[PDB]
C-alpha cells in the first residue's frame, strides 16, 4: 500500500564523497519507476541487464540505493567491465550486475568560484575492491605495507580531492549518482 | 497447461552442422526448466544473465532453441563476448545475451573410426555475423568478392570439415549444443 521513499534520497540536502558512499535499504513498498525514466531531472539514466520499462512488472525482496558524488569523466566508471581509480578503489560493480544508474549535474550546489574541495576520493589502496566493498579507512598508504604516518619518503596520504570550480567543463563538474540494485513490487 | 515440446529436440536422431543451424519455435506451453538441470544428460549447462532456478517464475512470448554440433574446443566460443571462427562466421551470441547453453558429449553417435566429415563449419566469409545471423551460402570465397572457380588462385571454398574419430581426445569430440533464448513457468 505504502509507496517507496524515493524523494528522501533525491531531495536529500547533503551527499557524501564517493569513497564513503551510503546505501539505503528499500522494503515493503510499491515502487513506481514509470515516473522516473519519464522525468527530465536526470541527464543520465542507465539500466544494465534490464530495461526500466519492465521494472514495473516485477517484485523484489529489497532494493538498495548507493548515493555518492563524482565528476563527469568518472561517471562512466560506474559500470560493469569498467576499470579505473573510481572502479578499482572506490566503487566496483559486478559484471553480472542487474540494475540502474542515475546521475545529474549539480554545478549549482557543489561548485564555487573558490573551489569546493570537500569532496575526496581514494587514489591508493592495497588491492582492488570486491563488488559493493567499502574501504573508508584513512591510514597513510605505504608500498611496503608497514604503517607510516609522516609525509616522508614512500609514505602518502590515501585520499585525494576533487576540485570543483564553476569554469570547468562537464567532465570536471560534480554529478550526484544514485545506483539501484518479494516486498518491493511494481504497480 | 500445455507442455513445451522439449524431448522432440533432445532425443532427435539427426542434428545439423553449425553453419546450417536450426531453430525450433516454442509456443503455447508451460516450460519447466527445473527438471532439466536435475538431469545428468548434459555435460555442459551454463546459463547467462539469469539463474535457471528463477526461470520457473518467468513468462515469455516465445522461446527459441538453436540446435547444432561442434567439437569441444569450439564449445567455449558459444558465449557472449567470445570471438573465434564459430562465433565470427557460424553462430554469434550477443554480449547482452539472456539464456542458457546446453551441451553433452556424443562421441558414440557422431564419431567413426574412418572419420565422420558430414559435419562442416564455415571458415571464410565477407564480414562477420550479426547476432543470430545464418549464412548457409556455399559460393567459392574470394577476397575481391568476384565469383571465381574454386581451384583457382585466391579462390577457396567457404566450408571446412570436422574430423570426428573415436581415437581423438575429448577436445576433438563432437558435442551437441542447444541454445535457449504464453510460454510461462508452472
Amino acid at each position, epitope marked *: 500500500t505504502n509507496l517507496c521513499p524515493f524523494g528522501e534520497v533525491f531531495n536529500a540536502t547533503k551527499f557524501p564523497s564517493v569513497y564513503a558512499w551510503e546505501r539505503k535499504k528499500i522494503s515493503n513498498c510499491v515502487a513506481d519507476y514509470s515516473v522516473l*525514466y519519464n522525468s*527530465t531531472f536526470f*541527464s*543520465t539514466f*542507465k539500466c544494465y541487464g534490464v*530495461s526500466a520499462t519492465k521494472l514495473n512488472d516485477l517484485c523484489f525482496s529489497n532494493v538498495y540505493a548507493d548515493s555518492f558524488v563524482v565528476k563527469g569523466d568518472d*561517471v562512466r566508471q560506474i559500470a560493469p567491465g569498467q576499470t579505473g581509480v573510481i572502479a578499482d578503489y572506490n566503487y566496483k560493480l559486478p559484471d553480472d550486475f542487474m540494475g540502474c544508474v542515475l546521475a545529474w549535474n549539480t554545478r549549482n550546489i557543489d561548485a564555487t568560484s573558490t573551489g569546493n574541495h570537500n569532496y575526496k576520493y581514494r587514489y591508493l589502496r592495497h588491492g582492488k575492491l570486491r563488488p559493493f566493498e567499502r574501504d573508508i579507512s584513512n591510514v597513510p598508504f605505504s608500498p611496503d605495507g608497514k604503517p607510516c604516518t609522516p609525509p616522508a619518503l614512500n609514505c602518502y596520504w590515501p585520499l585525494n580531492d576533487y576540485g570543483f570550480y564553476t569554469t570547468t567543463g562537464i567532465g570536471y563538474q560534480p554529478y550526484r549518482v544514485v545506483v539501484l540494485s518479494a516486498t518491493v513490487c511494481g504497480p | 497447461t500445455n507442455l513445451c515440446p522439449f524431448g522432440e529436440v533432445f532425443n532427435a536422431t539427426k542434428f545439423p552442422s553449425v553453419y546450417a543451424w536450426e531453430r525450433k519455435k516454442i509456443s503455447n506451453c508451460v516450460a519447466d526448466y527445473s527438471v532439466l538441470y536435475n538431469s545428468t544428460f548434459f555435460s555442459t549447462f551454463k546459463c547467462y544473465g539469469v539463474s535457471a532456478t528463477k526461470l520457473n517464475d518467468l513468462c515469455f512470448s516465445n522461446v527459441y532453441a538453436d540446435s547444432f554440433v561442434v567439437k569441444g574446443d569450439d564449445v567455449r566460443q558459444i558465449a557472449p563476448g567470445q570471438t573465434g571462427v564459430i562465433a565470427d562466421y557460424n553462430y554469434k551470441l*550477443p554480449d547482452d545475451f539472456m539464456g542458457c547453453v546446453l551441451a553433452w558429449n556424443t562421441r558414440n553417435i557422431d564419431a567413426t573410426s574412418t572419420g565422420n566429415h558430414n559435419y562442416k563449419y564455415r571458415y571464410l566469409r565477407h564480414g562477420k555475423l550479426r*547476432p543470430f545471423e545464418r549464412d548457409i551460402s556455399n559460393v567459392p570465397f574470394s577476397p575481391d568478392g568476384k565469383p571465381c572457380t574454386p581451384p583457382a588462385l585466391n579462390c577457396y571454398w567457404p566450408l571446412n570439415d570436422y574430423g570426428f574419430y573415436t581415437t581423438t581426445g575429448i577436445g576433438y569430440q563432437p558435442y551437441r549444443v542447444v541454445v535457449l533464448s504464453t510460454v510461462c513457468g508452472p
Partner: nanobody, 123 residues
Framework: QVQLVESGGGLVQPGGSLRLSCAASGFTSDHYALAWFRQAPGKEREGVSC???????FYADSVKGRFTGSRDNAKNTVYLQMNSLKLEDTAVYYCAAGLWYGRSLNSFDYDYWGQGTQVTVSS
C-alpha cells in the same frame, strides 16, 4: 569493428528543416540506445537527443518542440529531423550509441562516437 556514419548535413537557412541520418554497422550487442550530439568551436558537445533502446526518444530542453528523432527497426539507422532552425543551432553534429540498455544525455557515457557532419545556418 563498430562504425557510425553520419549523413545529411549541409548549409541551410533559418526557419528551415534538415534530416540527418547515421547508420551502425558492427554491433555485437542487441539493446544499445542511440543519440545525437552537437559541438560548436570552443564549446563542449551538448547532448541534443537520445533515443531509447528501440523505444521512446528524449530531447534536451534547448531543442524540445523543434527537433524530432527516431530509429529504424529493420535497419540500424537513426534519423533526426531539425525543424525551425536558428543561428545558435550551427554545430558539427555527431551520433553516438553506447551499450547500456538505457538512455543518457551526457557525452561521457557514450562508448562509441560517430563522425562530424557539419550543419551551418547562415545567409
Amino acid at each position: 569493428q563498430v562504425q557510425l556514419v553520419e549523413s545529411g548535413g549541409g548549409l541551410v537557412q533559418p526557419g528551415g528543416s534538415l534530416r540527418l541520418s547515421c547508420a551502425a554497422s558492427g554491433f555485437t550487442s542487441d539493446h544499445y540506445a542511440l543519440a545525437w550530439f552537437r559541438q560548436a568551436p570552443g564549446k563542449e558537445r551538448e547532448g541534443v537527443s537520445c533515443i531509447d533502446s528501440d523505444g521512446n526518444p528524449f530531447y534536451a530542453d534547448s531543442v524540445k518542440g523543434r527537433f524530432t528523432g527516431s530509429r529504424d527497426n529493420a535497419k540500424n539507422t537513426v534519423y533526426l529531423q531539425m525543424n525551425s532552425l536558428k543561428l545558435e543551432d550551427t554545430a558539427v553534429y555527431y551520433c553516438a550509441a553506447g551499450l547500456w540498455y538505457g538512455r543518457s544525455l551526457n557525452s561521457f557515457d557514450y562508448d562509441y562516437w560517430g563522425q562530424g557532419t557539419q550543419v551551418t545556418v547562415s545567409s
